[PDB]
């Protein structure tokens, strides 16, 4: 276990600083040159690492990142650098004879069969899905569009099946980790990342650490009830924030409001977050009102979170950030009016660096597993 951390800490460095020397790794990782020698030599003998100084070897090593969303599975074969080999997306019908679990395995098998020739060593699967997720054990408790899913052993069934580690994460936590490693929150101690998407929620980084990291519970603010009379949520409650502020719910609402309007510009195109944001940025009062509304709800909850966590940055990750110039000040205003001035004083509401499209976040699951060394040791089996 001590071995596990050390290897990962040294891999991290090679990854981040390579070309880098054995001598340098020694001081930076605070580890005896002898330990560094040992760790590095295992890495060389596995082709996890190459010489020139030390550097990572990424081509020979692949992973699958899956993403699941409403009626769709995305699959991507990628290098450990995260470079894409092949990408597919497929129908995942919402209702079917077969359990979702199988249908999933089925899609994966088809992928390997199809692109079997592009495959180098498969190291792991990174999965990113909506729902209520035990990322420790890879259990999907409940999830949004496939009503059929209850305590689904996604992680275990897939490890059993592929013989490879399965890293499963919620979309939001995955994204938070991506922004932490590669994004807008690198080397930040205290961040709250809010995501307004098909999901509503947040990841938190406190004292430099991802809250709940590698535990079986997540930050689950999207399921704090805001309407005691609202629509049923897949969590098993009703009126959850996600019910009101998810992108899909905003758009259902806009549609209903649009139906009573004959004045709105949103009548010009099919209704999409993009047209929503486009219209609001022009001063369409309906569109603006809608975005303002979401602002108020998210602001409110974010304000509570500010009082508890005292973050340095707030990252909004969302299609609505197209309308940053309406959305962000509303969030800002809530936080200023609703959190301790001393905590709320010099807080920037800023957008996320990434838009989290496709399977891009999977890289954060893998690098994370390399860095904490868990995947690393599994790899050093050979």
Residues that bind a copy of itself (CB under 8 A): 1, 30, 132, 141, 189-190, 202, 204, 206-208, 211-215, 217, 219-221, 223-225, 228, 235-238, 300-301, 303-305, 307-310, 337-343
Residue pair 308/344 in contact (Cβ under 8 Å)? The answer is no
Peptide bond into 223 cis (omega under 30): no
116 binds, among Zn ion, a copy of itself, none (CB under 5 to 8 A by kind): none
The rounded radius of gyration (Å) of the Cα atoms in the chain is: 22
Closest approach, Cβ 246 to a copy of itself, in A, equals: 15
Residue 53, contacted partner among a copy of itself, Zn ion, none, CB below 5-8 A by kind: none
Residue 338 binding partner per list Zn ion, a copy of itself, none, with a CB distance cut-off of 5 to 8 Å that depends on partner kind? a copy of itself
**Of 89 and 224, CB closest to a copy of itself:** 224
Q: Which is closer to a copy of itself, CB of 208 or CB of 283? A: 208
Which residue, 18, 145, 28, 2, is CA-closest to 81? Answer: 18
Nearer Cβ to a copy of itself (23/340): 340
For Zn ion, the binding residues (CB under 5 A) are 223, 233, 235, 237, 240
Residues 6+ apart with CB under 8 A from 110: none
Cβ closer to Zn ion: 7 or 200? 200
**Alpha-carbon 238 to chain mean position:** 24
Please check if 267 is assigned to a binding site.
Answer: no
Q: What are the residue ranges of helices labelled H in the chain?
A: 2-17, 22-28, 33-46, 100-114, 154-162, 171-181, 241-245, 247-260, 273-282, 285-309, 324-338, 341-344, 362-371, 374-379
Distance of CA 339 to the CA centre of its chain: 27
CB of 207 to a copy of itself, least distance (A): 3
Structure tokens at 330: 């509303």
H helix or E strand, kind and range, residue 315: strand 313-317
DSSP 231: P
Quote the least distance from Cβ 30 to a copy of itself, whole Å. 7
CB of 336 to a copy of itself, least distance (A): 8
Give the nearer residue to a copy of itself in terms of CB position, either 270 or 341. Answer: 341
> Does 277 count as an annotated binding residue?
no
Q: Name which of 341 and 382 has its Cβ closer to a copy of itself.
A: 341
Q: What's the min distance (Å) between Cβ of 12 and a copy of itself? A: 17
Q: What angle do CA 5, 11, 17 make, to 5 degrees?
A: 130
CB of 139 to Zn ion, least distance (A): 17
Would you list which residues are annotated within the binding site?
223, 233, 235, 240
Would you list which residues are annotated within the binding site for Zn(2+)?
223, 233, 235, 240
């Amino acid at each position: 276990q001590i071995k596990q951390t050390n290897a990962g800490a040294v891999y991290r460095l090679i990854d981040q600083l390579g070309p880098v020397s054995r001598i340098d790794l020694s001081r930076l990782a605070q580890l005896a040159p002898a330990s560094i020698t040992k760790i590095v030599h295992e890495m060389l003998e596995a082709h996890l690492v190459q010489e020139l100084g030390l550097v990572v070897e990424t081509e020979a090593w692949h992973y699958l990142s899956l993403r699941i969303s409403r009626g769709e599975i995305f699959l991507a074969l990628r290098d450990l650098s995260s470079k894409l080999v092949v990408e597919e997306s497929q129908e995942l019908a919402l209702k079917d004879d077969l359990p979702l679990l199988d249908r999933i395995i089925s899609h994966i098998d088809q992928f390997f069969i199809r692109h079997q020739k592009k495959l180098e060593r498969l190291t792991s699967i990174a999965i990113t899905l909506p729902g209520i997720i035990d990322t420790e054990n890879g259990i999907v408790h409940r999830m949004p569009f496939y009503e059929d899913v209850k305590e689904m052993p996604l992680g275990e069934a897939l490890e059993q099946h592929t013989g490879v580690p399965v890293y499963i994460q919620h979309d939001i936590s995955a994204w938070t980790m991506a922004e932490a490693l590669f994004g807008a929150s690198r080397g930040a101690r205290d961040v709250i990342q809010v995501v307004i998407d098909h999901n509503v929620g947040a990841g938190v980084i406190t004292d430099g650490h991802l809250l709940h990291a590698g535990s079986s519970s997540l930050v689950e603010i999207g399921h704090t009830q805001v309407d005691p009379y609202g629509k049923r949520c897949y969590c098993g409650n009703h009126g959850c924030l996600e019910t009101i502020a998810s992108v899909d719910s905003i758009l259902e609402l806009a549609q209903l409001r649009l139906n009573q309007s004959m004045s709105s510009m949103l009548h010009g195109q099919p209704l999409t977050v993009d047209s929503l944001c486009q219209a609001a940025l022009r001063g369409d009062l309906l569109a603006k009102d809608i975005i303002t509304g979401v602002g108020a709800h998210v602001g409110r909850i974010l304000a509570i979170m500010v009082n508890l966590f005292n973050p340095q940055k707030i990252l909004i990750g969302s299609p609505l950030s197209k309308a940053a110039d309406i959305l962000f000040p509303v969030i800002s205003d809530s936080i200023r009016q609703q959190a301790l001035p001393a905590y709320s004083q010099h807080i920037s509401v800023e957008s996320t660096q990434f838009s989290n499209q496709g399977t891009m976040a999977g890289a954060a699951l893998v690098k994370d597993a390399m860095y904490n060394g868990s995947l690393l040791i599994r790899l050093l089996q050979g």
